[PDB]
Amino acid sequence: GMSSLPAVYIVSSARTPVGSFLGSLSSLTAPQLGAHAIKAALAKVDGLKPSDVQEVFFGNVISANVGQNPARQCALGAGLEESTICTTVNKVCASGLKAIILGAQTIMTGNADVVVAGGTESMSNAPHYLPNLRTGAKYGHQSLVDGIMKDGLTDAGKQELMGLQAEECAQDHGFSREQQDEYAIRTYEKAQAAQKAGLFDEEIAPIQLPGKPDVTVTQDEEPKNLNPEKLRAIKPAFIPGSGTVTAPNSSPLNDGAAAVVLVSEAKLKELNLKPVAKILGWGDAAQQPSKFTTAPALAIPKALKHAGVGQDAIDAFEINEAFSVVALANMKLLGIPEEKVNLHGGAVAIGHPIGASGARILTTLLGVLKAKKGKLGCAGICNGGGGASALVVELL
Amino acid sequence: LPAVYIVSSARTPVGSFLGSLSSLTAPQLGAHAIKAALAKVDGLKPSDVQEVFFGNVISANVGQNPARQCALGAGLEESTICTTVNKVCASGLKAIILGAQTIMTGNADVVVAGGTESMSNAPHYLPNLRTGAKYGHQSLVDGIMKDGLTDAGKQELMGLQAEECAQDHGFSREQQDEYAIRTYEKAQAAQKAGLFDEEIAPIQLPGFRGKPDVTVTQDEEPKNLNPEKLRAIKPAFIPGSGTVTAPNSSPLNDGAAAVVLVSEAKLKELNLKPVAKILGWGDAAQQPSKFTTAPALAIPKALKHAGVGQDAIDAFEINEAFSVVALANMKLLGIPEEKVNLHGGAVAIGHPIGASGARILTTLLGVLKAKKGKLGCAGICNGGGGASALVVELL
Amino acid sequence: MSSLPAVYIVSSARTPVGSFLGSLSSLTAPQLGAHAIKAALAKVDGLKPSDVQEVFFGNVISANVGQNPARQCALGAGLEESTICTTVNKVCASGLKAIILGAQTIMTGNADVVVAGGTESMSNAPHYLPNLRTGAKYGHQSLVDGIMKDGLTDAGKQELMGLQAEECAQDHGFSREQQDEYAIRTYEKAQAAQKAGLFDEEIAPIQLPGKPDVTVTQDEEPKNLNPEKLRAIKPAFIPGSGTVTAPNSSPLNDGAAAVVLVSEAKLKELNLKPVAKILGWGDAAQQPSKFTTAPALAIPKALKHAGVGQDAIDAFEINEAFSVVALANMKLLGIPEEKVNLHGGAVAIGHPIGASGARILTTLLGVLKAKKGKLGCAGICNGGGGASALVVELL
Amino acid sequence: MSSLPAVYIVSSARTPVGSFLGSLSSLTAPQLGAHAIKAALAKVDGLKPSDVQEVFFGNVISANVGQNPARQCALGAGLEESTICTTVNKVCASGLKAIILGAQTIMTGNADVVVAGGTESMSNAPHYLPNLRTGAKYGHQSLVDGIMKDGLTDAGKQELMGLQAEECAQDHGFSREQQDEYAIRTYEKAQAAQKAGLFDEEIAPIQLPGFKPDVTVTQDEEPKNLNPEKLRAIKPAFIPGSGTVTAPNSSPLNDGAAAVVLVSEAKLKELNLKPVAKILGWGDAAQQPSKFTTAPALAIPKALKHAGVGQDAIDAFEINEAFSVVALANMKLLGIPEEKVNLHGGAVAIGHPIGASGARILTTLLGVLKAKKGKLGCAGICNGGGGASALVVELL
Ligand SMILES: [Cl-]
Ligand SMILES: [Cl-]
Ligand SMILES: [Cl-]
Ligand SMILES: [Cl-]
Ligand SMILES: [Rb+]
Ligand SMILES: [Rb+]
Ligand SMILES: [Rb+]
Ligand SMILES: [Rb+]
Ligand SMILES: [Rb+]
Ligand SMILES: [Rb+]
Ligand SMILES: [Rb+]
Ligand SMILES: [Rb+]
Ligand SMILES: [Rb+]
Ligand SMILES: [Rb+]
Ligand SMILES: [Rb+]
Ligand SMILES: [Rb+]
Ligand SMILES: [Rb+]
């Protein structure tokens, strides 16, 4: 059981704003975004130094042309000691949450006391691939492969976009274009309402862009884009005519990063640190790849069981909105009412930098718990390939 | 914390760059190694495997989650948890470490861990098509150079980091060439004595347009040694004064390796016979350009974590990123070469970077069984300034 | 020359000249060329498009335009499938060499009605991947900009034309200031001609399918004159001491131009009213990096072929590949600027390279009419060392 | 043409024709062209390379060849920087239209010594990336094969010329078997000519310097590849099942160049040059693009009428074998017996470097007239887009 293992505390978290594809943060690389989130998270822990960080796990999916070990570049960019252990993690969309699980485990096996974990993604700076230049292609037109499509959005087995599998999800659990559109509208409003109230101000670390004075990106870029008129009238994106999944009710392509700082019980009292939360348990699950959309229906109960906590005891859920239908399907399958789900909006309105989103939603979950005066939270995120990861936190 | 047992391991032949295995993708190599290792364990079904950690560095164009593709191609259940890991050249060993940790915290009873790389199939990148470039010649980036072989800070290839290592600790073109010949001869002796045959799962490549079927059983590189050609070849990274060459460096390669890990409880429940027991591990890191000598920190950290002294180890696998890397670390730890890489190393065998961390552990178990040894240690440096080390006991 | 059958220009037309990636960048080179051909034929009272027997059309950067750009221009303009079509490349002189060949084909009796001219879409010039058939096993590769490679780079020196312009400033002693004042004068002349409607007759406006429809009626570059910015900008090819700038060089541009040529017998048969008579021509060439002053050879040769003295020419068109090219040829030939490019030149109007040779001829006929002149001469240098020139009489 | 100034051929020369990515693939198009020009000039006793005033050179796929391929050919062959140089593109007819334009430039008195011909390096045709200047934000992108785009595809229908060859087989009733047995006969004629040394005079062997032993390329690469059983058993190349056009009975893709040296009557007498042949006339013609296959049935009578020569007076024809079916159809339409056609084999067996073939077949034609003691020859060559060019010569 968890209680036979040492405790792990979150003592801070931070995230960049989430920029739009080729948008506000498109000039920064994935490690520049990662360094920014790590540095801002560490600056929040009173009593802890960046040189105290021993190990880093950082998610990143589309690592092509990012260079050697994205996590190492995030760590050194943030002013961490060159002695820091750094590992990049790829569990597609869940990478940012699995990096946190692996960070927690490294404290629990006793191999570190201070760990930074999270994820980063610069989808704007994902390149195109030329796959056959070494052996040559003697004759015929050839292809420049979009690295986002190939390594981020296509299921490897069926060679099928995730949106076509989200469409399969809509067929599977009975959710219409209208049901997905009105959900999409509601989470955009929740995200806009949070923005208007300043409820992202704590978690977000504004970015200063050089160039005489500086430009500052302080807000997530996608929430303001809501136009309910065009949203309900838009042509569907994956099945012309009878499709239900659209770009407005799907997650966008985005840039962003998020980071949490984990410490062991020894270091927490030895440095007399203020803990923000405790990790109570986690769960990974996986099923048929084309059914990844509902893999949180397995991961979430497994994480609750690991934590020894009931689904009704949870005050707030973060169920990552890869698509609107993903949130609706898992809510129906679990019997979770939407009034406890994605209370400041979700990825459909906020953005989905795929390697970071597992940590982004945990960052937001902590804000939701403080803002709405809850204690227990559960984050669940599906990933292409059939999997999902889930985590259970107690606000301290 | 619960004990972690290795019940089997397997590896592909290591193919040469654009060579015997260049038609196979990294998930194809990885799946091959996984189901080969699982077939060696009687009493364990492939459906018993709950989680997979697989190393892979140059993942571009491999498709979503290389480790998931390795697991599903190997016949594992769609319920398996699959994570791809990149710690550059240490990826295959760090995957095994994460796998053992997952057993130790009680979240899995059967884990497959390892690594794969198809350097033959690493693409080139066009990085500015999305925003465009109005006028000017543009660059196609070689993914091997950018994401595998170039240090991020210095923007210098690994062979220049290895020239630092030579000047830092005092090894000449002669001492590195003599070492390369010794490890080539050690690799050729093992092939002839059949000492790789257990650990290598041969790959069948059937041609069927009237073409003949092909079986790859050997590692492709060891046979290529020519000491006369080796000694007289020109330097590769610094003209005239350089000590590092292509023959005394590791090559680019294709390969995969896997281990099956089980918990103390599952080993008893299913009546499994263990091959080894993981005793401890250690990750370490220092200045990025000095990554060549990071094993000098990782290896003692892994020895200390395991409660085992340096003089107790029967054999070391110190991954030969370059001949000079083995020579430098052998100097700083005080290890005699008579207890290092006893069946050859990556200079002669090949270096599919994502896989080598698990490749040298696989070969290490073959060293201990053949030499009738008890305690083995493997450490592997990685670009960025880090290294990973692991200590096993044969049973 | 006079001892051969006479050749008459019965019409001419040009597109507006669009800026690089500007107002005409959505049209392909054959679409621009077809537009110019159709508009030239529409001006000839008593001649049908079906009477056109043969086409010569210039085009330099033909990559990805498809088979035989000239044939595509011809069919796109509505000419018969019986029409003989040949694409011509003499780099920047292509459009004028095309007209020379068209005249010769009438002179040797093989046609009575010929359309000739040139077209270029520099906006739609592709990038090249040169080594994908045989492969490149390892290393960063390049994507070659087709404009630089096939248009603007001298093959022997592998230096861009701007550096040949600097050779010209050094060889004939023209400072940054002299080049800048020339550039301002030619922009002013182009703007004046524009505003006075003097390009209205020669230009065939282009309608783009719509948003609603957009019509392009004016050359895009002339309005861009800013004298203060032009005098203060940094030099574009040699830092610090350079003299050649983007303002005082020709730009990259899109456009086409065409003339309709007929024999003397066909003029009478169809009772056609000629606009001008071709009196003679000349090509010349010298050292490739000195292509800038090859018109100082080709212009005297064309005048001698035409049996016309230099002083009798009422207006010259000396193509402004750079401001320094006009200055140097005016100096070498002793031609006063008051007789040169009277409605502006390519520094201000634009330089679609395969078309400019025919573009300046169309403009020259307009100049001779507007300024009440009879004899004109067009001269255009080209990458590689060459130049072409042609003498016309306005009737 | 009789009332027009005379034009003499004083020499000709061609490279060996190399297979696609074969014996000559390391040479650029201007390197091949320079070789042919220099070799042709070396044959003229009493004429210097510095006497050449003007050059017309065919070349179709000029992408990445650099400025003015013809100029590069001329300067590479050692001609003066004063030489006037123009590159010509009438697709497959380029090399013969170049010679026509060269003859005209003598006839109008603007030159007395002209070199004309053509060159193609199909091995070194690049691929194109068409949308890098404006960018392409998202999606896989095409790399266009320059051979397919600029050499082999009719611009109107976007149809490969092999498909229009099938239209020819259907239009004129030529079976798979008629095309195959024609192909075998022309391979046999090429082999027989090769073996008897009948190409030795016209071919200029190429010496490739070793980077490694030097390599001399002496013979055309394709004739030896004839395998009659495999030629008859191979699948069709363009229409599965019912197709009649195959790779063996079509022209290959090839590298090579050819050149002729032309002089005026005055210059022939001034330098006391020995003429090889006289150009008697020429003709170009065109029709519906997809019927380019039988455009030589228009060009040949037009060139004969221009020359004042009857079809029956011709001792030998070169009808360029773009496809076997092209030679069969033009022989049928014009009533020309095969025993007068391509007496040393044609492009199906020798190869088809498209910018050079128009000049290559004229060089070979001069060799056939000498070997067979003929006097009057006619070369005709169809070209993509609907055209053809033809030329009549008299051996002196
Ligand atoms: Cl998965
Ligand atoms: Cl590292
Ligand atoms: Cl030239
Ligand atoms: Cl045509
Ligand atoms: Rb701090
Ligand atoms: Rb903040
Ligand atoms: Rb959206
Ligand atoms: Rb088994
Ligand atoms: Rb085996
Ligand atoms: Rb080696
Ligand atoms: Rb008309
Ligand atoms: Rb008329
Ligand atoms: Rb007009
Ligand atoms: Rb300009
Ligand atoms: Rb000679
Ligand atoms: Rb010869
Ligand atoms: Rb053939």
PDB file of N, CA and C in Angstrom, chain A residues 21-22 128 130 137-150 153 161 253, chain D residues 20-21 127 129 136-149 152 160 253:
ATOM      1  N   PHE A  21      -1.299  27.866 -31.854  1.00  0.00           N
ATOM      2  CA  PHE A  21      -0.431  27.350 -32.903  1.00  0.00           C
ATOM      3  C   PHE A  21       0.081  28.500 -33.764  1.00  0.00           C
ATOM      4  N   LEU A  22       1.405  28.564 -33.942  1.00  0.00           N
ATOM      5  CA  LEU A  22       2.066  29.678 -34.632  1.00  0.00           C
ATOM      6  C   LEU A  22       1.658  31.023 -34.038  1.00  0.00           C
ATOM      7  N   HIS A 128       8.788  19.356 -40.241  1.00  0.00           N
ATOM      8  CA  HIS A 128       8.452  18.331 -41.218  1.00  0.00           C
ATOM      9  C   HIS A 128       9.649  17.409 -41.414  1.00  0.00           C
ATOM     10  N   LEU A 130      11.861  14.567 -43.737  1.00  0.00           N
ATOM     11  CA  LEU A 130      12.190  13.941 -45.009  1.00  0.00           C
ATOM     12  C   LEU A 130      12.717  12.540 -44.722  1.00  0.00           C
ATOM     13  N   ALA A 137      15.463   7.877 -53.005  1.00  0.00           N
ATOM     14  CA  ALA A 137      14.233   7.454 -53.661  1.00  0.00           C
ATOM     15  C   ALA A 137      14.422   7.773 -55.134  1.00  0.00           C
ATOM     16  N   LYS A 138      14.568   6.728 -55.941  1.00  0.00           N
ATOM     17  CA  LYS A 138      15.079   6.888 -57.298  1.00  0.00           C
ATOM     18  C   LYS A 138      14.149   7.719 -58.179  1.00  0.00           C
ATOM     19  N   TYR A 139      12.842   7.528 -58.044  1.00  0.00           N
ATOM     20  CA  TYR A 139      11.913   8.099 -59.006  1.00  0.00           C
ATOM     21  C   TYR A 139      10.534   8.212 -58.371  1.00  0.00           C
ATOM     22  N   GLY A 140       9.870   9.326 -58.638  1.00  0.00           N
ATOM     23  CA  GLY A 140       8.523   9.584 -58.190  1.00  0.00           C
ATOM     24  C   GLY A 140       8.473  10.731 -57.192  1.00  0.00           C
ATOM     25  N   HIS A 141       7.298  11.348 -57.105  1.00  0.00           N
ATOM     26  CA  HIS A 141       7.054  12.325 -56.053  1.00  0.00           C
ATOM     27  C   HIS A 141       7.267  11.704 -54.679  1.00  0.00           C
ATOM     28  N   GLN A 142       7.721  12.517 -53.737  1.00  0.00           N
ATOM     29  CA  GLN A 142       7.970  12.030 -52.399  1.00  0.00           C
ATOM     30  C   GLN A 142       7.224  12.922 -51.426  1.00  0.00           C
ATOM     31  N   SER A 143       7.388  12.657 -50.140  1.00  0.00           N
ATOM     32  CA  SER A 143       6.530  13.282 -49.153  1.00  0.00           C
ATOM     33  C   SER A 143       7.360  13.946 -48.067  1.00  0.00           C
ATOM     34  N   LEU A 144       6.907  15.120 -47.642  1.00  0.00           N
ATOM     35  CA  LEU A 144       7.404  15.782 -46.448  1.00  0.00           C
ATOM     36  C   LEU A 144       6.368  15.549 -45.363  1.00  0.00           C
ATOM     37  N   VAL A 145       6.752  14.792 -44.343  1.00  0.00           N
ATOM     38  CA  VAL A 145       5.846  14.307 -43.308  1.00  0.00           C
ATOM     39  C   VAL A 145       5.704  15.366 -42.227  1.00  0.00           C
ATOM     40  N   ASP A 146       4.462  15.721 -41.898  1.00  0.00           N
ATOM     41  CA  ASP A 146       4.201  16.658 -40.808  1.00  0.00           C
ATOM     42  C   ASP A 146       4.424  15.967 -39.458  1.00  0.00           C
ATOM     43  N   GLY A 147       5.408  16.454 -38.696  1.00  0.00           N
ATOM     44  CA  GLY A 147       5.783  15.785 -37.455  1.00  0.00           C
ATOM     45  C   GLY A 147       4.703  15.802 -36.389  1.00  0.00           C
ATOM     46  N   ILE A 148       3.840  16.823 -36.402  1.00  0.00           N
ATOM     47  CA  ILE A 148       2.692  16.842 -35.502  1.00  0.00           C
ATOM     48  C   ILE A 148       1.736  15.709 -35.843  1.00  0.00           C
ATOM     49  N   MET A 149       1.399  15.566 -37.125  1.00  0.00           N
ATOM     50  CA  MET A 149       0.484  14.504 -37.526  1.00  0.00           C
ATOM     51  C   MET A 149       1.061  13.130 -37.218  1.00  0.00           C
ATOM     52  N   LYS A 150       2.338  12.921 -37.541  1.00  0.00           N
ATOM     53  CA  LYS A 150       2.948  11.599 -37.483  1.00  0.00           C
ATOM     54  C   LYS A 150       3.212  11.151 -36.048  1.00  0.00           C
ATOM     55  N   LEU A 153      -0.466  13.063 -33.419  1.00  0.00           N
ATOM     56  CA  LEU A 153      -1.916  12.975 -33.565  1.00  0.00           C
ATOM     57  C   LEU A 153      -2.431  11.716 -34.242  1.00  0.00           C
ATOM     58  N   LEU A 161      -6.253   9.388 -37.582  1.00  0.00           N
ATOM     59  CA  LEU A 161      -6.208  10.555 -36.708  1.00  0.00           C
ATOM     60  C   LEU A 161      -7.037  10.314 -35.453  1.00  0.00           C
ATOM     61  N   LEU A 253      -4.072  22.898 -31.402  1.00  0.00           N
ATOM     62  CA  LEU A 253      -2.629  22.734 -31.303  1.00  0.00           C
ATOM     63  C   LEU A 253      -2.060  23.919 -30.528  1.00  0.00           C
TER      64      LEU A 253
ATOM     65  N   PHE D  20      19.850   5.732 -66.538  1.00  0.00           N
ATOM     66  CA  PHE D  20      19.385   6.492 -65.371  1.00  0.00           C
ATOM     67  C   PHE D  20      20.128   6.049 -64.116  1.00  0.00           C
ATOM     68  N   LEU D  21      20.813   6.993 -63.461  1.00  0.00           N
ATOM     69  CA  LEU D  21      21.638   6.742 -62.264  1.00  0.00           C
ATOM     70  C   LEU D  21      22.764   5.748 -62.550  1.00  0.00           C
ATOM     71  N   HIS D 127      14.309  17.139 -57.100  1.00  0.00           N
ATOM     72  CA  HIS D 127      12.928  17.269 -56.652  1.00  0.00           C
ATOM     73  C   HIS D 127      12.682  18.709 -56.213  1.00  0.00           C
ATOM     74  N   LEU D 129      10.451  21.586 -53.869  1.00  0.00           N
ATOM     75  CA  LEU D 129       9.570  21.952 -52.762  1.00  0.00           C
ATOM     76  C   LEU D 129       8.883  23.256 -53.146  1.00  0.00           C
ATOM     77  N   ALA D 136       3.683  26.528 -45.371  1.00  0.00           N
ATOM     78  CA  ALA D 136       2.529  25.640 -45.315  1.00  0.00           C
ATOM     79  C   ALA D 136       2.338  25.295 -43.849  1.00  0.00           C
ATOM     80  N   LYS D 137       1.238  25.760 -43.261  1.00  0.00           N
ATOM     81  CA  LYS D 137       1.147  25.768 -41.801  1.00  0.00           C
ATOM     82  C   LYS D 137       0.986  24.368 -41.217  1.00  0.00           C
ATOM     83  N   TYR D 138       0.219  23.503 -41.872  1.00  0.00           N
ATOM     84  CA  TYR D 138      -0.115  22.218 -41.270  1.00  0.00           C
ATOM     85  C   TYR D 138      -0.450  21.209 -42.358  1.00  0.00           C
ATOM     86  N   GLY D 139       0.114  20.007 -42.251  1.00  0.00           N
ATOM     87  CA  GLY D 139      -0.211  18.938 -43.174  1.00  0.00           C
ATOM     88  C   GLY D 139       0.994  18.402 -43.922  1.00  0.00           C
ATOM     89  N   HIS D 140       0.912  17.153 -44.381  1.00  0.00           N
ATOM     90  CA  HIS D 140       1.952  16.587 -45.234  1.00  0.00           C
ATOM     91  C   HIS D 140       2.074  17.395 -46.519  1.00  0.00           C
ATOM     92  N   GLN D 141       3.293  17.442 -47.069  1.00  0.00           N
ATOM     93  CA  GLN D 141       3.593  18.256 -48.236  1.00  0.00           C
ATOM     94  C   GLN D 141       4.328  17.419 -49.272  1.00  0.00           C
ATOM     95  N   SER D 142       4.150  17.783 -50.531  1.00  0.00           N
ATOM     96  CA  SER D 142       4.670  16.996 -51.635  1.00  0.00           C
ATOM     97  C   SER D 142       6.049  17.492 -52.049  1.00  0.00           C
ATOM     98  N   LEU D 143       6.911  16.548 -52.424  1.00  0.00           N
ATOM     99  CA  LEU D 143       8.179  16.826 -53.101  1.00  0.00           C
ATOM    100  C   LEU D 143       8.038  16.340 -54.536  1.00  0.00           C
ATOM    101  N   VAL D 144       8.009  17.287 -55.469  1.00  0.00           N
ATOM    102  CA  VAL D 144       7.677  17.021 -56.861  1.00  0.00           C
ATOM    103  C   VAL D 144       8.923  16.508 -57.569  1.00  0.00           C
ATOM    104  N   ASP D 145       8.793  15.386 -58.272  1.00  0.00           N
ATOM    105  CA  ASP D 145       9.885  14.852 -59.084  1.00  0.00           C
ATOM    106  C   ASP D 145      10.003  15.648 -60.385  1.00  0.00           C
ATOM    107  N   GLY D 146      11.133  16.345 -60.574  1.00  0.00           N
ATOM    108  CA  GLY D 146      11.270  17.233 -61.720  1.00  0.00           C
ATOM    109  C   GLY D 146      11.191  16.538 -63.066  1.00  0.00           C
ATOM    110  N   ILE D 147      11.599  15.266 -63.134  1.00  0.00           N
ATOM    111  CA  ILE D 147      11.447  14.515 -64.381  1.00  0.00           C
ATOM    112  C   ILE D 147       9.974  14.362 -64.730  1.00  0.00           C
ATOM    113  N   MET D 148       9.167  13.932 -63.760  1.00  0.00           N
ATOM    114  CA  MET D 148       7.744  13.748 -64.013  1.00  0.00           C
ATOM    115  C   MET D 148       7.091  15.063 -64.393  1.00  0.00           C
ATOM    116  N   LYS D 149       7.435  16.138 -63.677  1.00  0.00           N
ATOM    117  CA  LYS D 149       6.744  17.416 -63.836  1.00  0.00           C
ATOM    118  C   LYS D 149       7.141  18.132 -65.116  1.00  0.00           C
ATOM    119  N   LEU D 152       8.098  14.604 -68.344  1.00  0.00           N
ATOM    120  CA  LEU D 152       7.308  13.465 -68.792  1.00  0.00           C
ATOM    121  C   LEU D 152       5.799  13.667 -68.765  1.00  0.00           C
ATOM    122  N   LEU D 160       0.831  11.515 -67.922  1.00  0.00           N
ATOM    123  CA  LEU D 160       2.126  11.004 -68.350  1.00  0.00           C
ATOM    124  C   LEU D 160       2.092  10.625 -69.828  1.00  0.00           C
ATOM    125  N   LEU D 253      14.944   6.414 -69.196  1.00  0.00           N
ATOM    126  CA  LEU D 253      15.472   7.716 -68.799  1.00  0.00           C
ATOM    127  C   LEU D 253      16.988   7.621 -68.870  1.00  0.00           C
TER     128      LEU D 253
END
